[PDB]
Design a protein around this ligand. Structure first.
Ligand SMILES: *N(C)CC(=O)NCc1ccc(CNC(=O)CN(*)C)cc1
Lengths: 14, 85
């Protein structure tokens, strides 16, 4: 969903 | 990958959605926190980058009534205040 797609972007910064 | 240590209140939040350890990678901390926000439906159904946390333990730990998932540096800073030095 749209929440899960925004949260995946934080993951990229790790 | 580097291991970090949650303070006792943040630890209890991660263990409420299945976590089994005392130390985690930052990718593992972000996995369990995301599963917590979605199972308690704290995200706004219409505008899904906004999280509303005034009436949850997450708001007491972060010191805010709400935050945006777009603000990457602010979210990493709120997590760091809740790790053992
Ligand atoms: N949201 C629609 C529910 C869902 O499909 N969950 C599956 C899910 C959720 C979170 C992750 C985390 N992925 C990673 O760690 C990859 N980034 C490094 C995976 C699957």
């Amino acid at each position: 969903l749209t929440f899960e797609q925004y949260w995946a972007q934080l993951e990229s910064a790790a | 990958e580097t291991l970090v240590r949650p303070k006792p209140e943040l630890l209890k939040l991660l263990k409420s959605v299945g976590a089994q350890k005392d130390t985690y990678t930052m990718k593992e901390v972000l996995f369990y926190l995301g599963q917590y926000i979605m199972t308690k439906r704290l995200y706004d159904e219409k505008q899904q980058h906004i999280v509303y946390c005034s009436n949850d333990l997450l708001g007491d730990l972060f010191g805010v009534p709400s935050f945006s998932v777009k603000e990457h540096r602010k979210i990493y800073t709120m997590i760091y205040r809740n790790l053992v030095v």
